[PDB]
Symmetry: D2
Subunit: 56 residues, 4 copies
RNA sequence: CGUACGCGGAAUACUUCGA
RNA sequence: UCGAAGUAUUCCGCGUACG
RNA sequence: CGUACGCGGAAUACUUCGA
RNA sequence: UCGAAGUAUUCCGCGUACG
């Protein structure tokens, strides 16, 4: 029986997003300071050089 | 197993809302042109003049 | 204070309504004998496959 | 720019919630183990014992 | 005591896209 | 080397609410 | 043929807020 | 007389997508 404006629903999520966003930004930094990468994270990196060095 | 960006869920509800807004705008106008009002839309109006008159 | 439980429930109804909005709307096009360009293909493309089994 | 079935948006929130729900459940059991309560929880508790010992 | 949502504050791991 | 998102395993504090 | 979604485009009615 | 939001009956067109 509560009037829940769409605008008010939108809002709650925007928050849930920027929150969840700020968590990666921080988690990302934490992983750099440890020097950690996920299997995939490595594979992108390695390949990236391969390509661009192979360019000149 | 498709990924659903919150930024999208938002973008969607944003749409739902304007569509829902413009409806009213048209609808509200359509009413005025017939001169129709609701039982609720009456009390408020009547009560407003009465209040507004009871001021001057 | 907006519990998630509500966002859910609010959206539930909305879907179930847009459901009937179609279910009715679909049935309505049938009594006219109207189809979409897309519905023609999906229809005439379908029989060809069935008239070929027996 | 892909279509998003409202069933799936919902399907996401359901999940999301069932998480929130499950953290609180264990987080609650974590407190109970340390015997830690909240100011709110102190009243709620005490203010309940007096309405309990009296009214029966 | 038991149940229920809200919010603010932070870990750790994995995958997917894109230059 | 950058950028974007998604998924799981976690911890802390306060705050209404309901019998 | 049956079934599940998406999108954009409309009418009509009623209620709660707020000056 | 203005602004905002929420619920209801109902209608139309194209698009996929499934067996």
């Amino acid at each position: 029986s509560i009037e829940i404006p769409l605008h008010e629903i939108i809002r709650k999520l925007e928050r849930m997003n920027q929150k969840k966003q700020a968590q990666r930004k921080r988690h990302k930094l934490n992983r750099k300071e440890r020097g950690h990468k996920s299997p995939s994270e490595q594979r992108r990196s390695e390949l990236w050089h391969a390509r661009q060095v192979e360019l000149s």
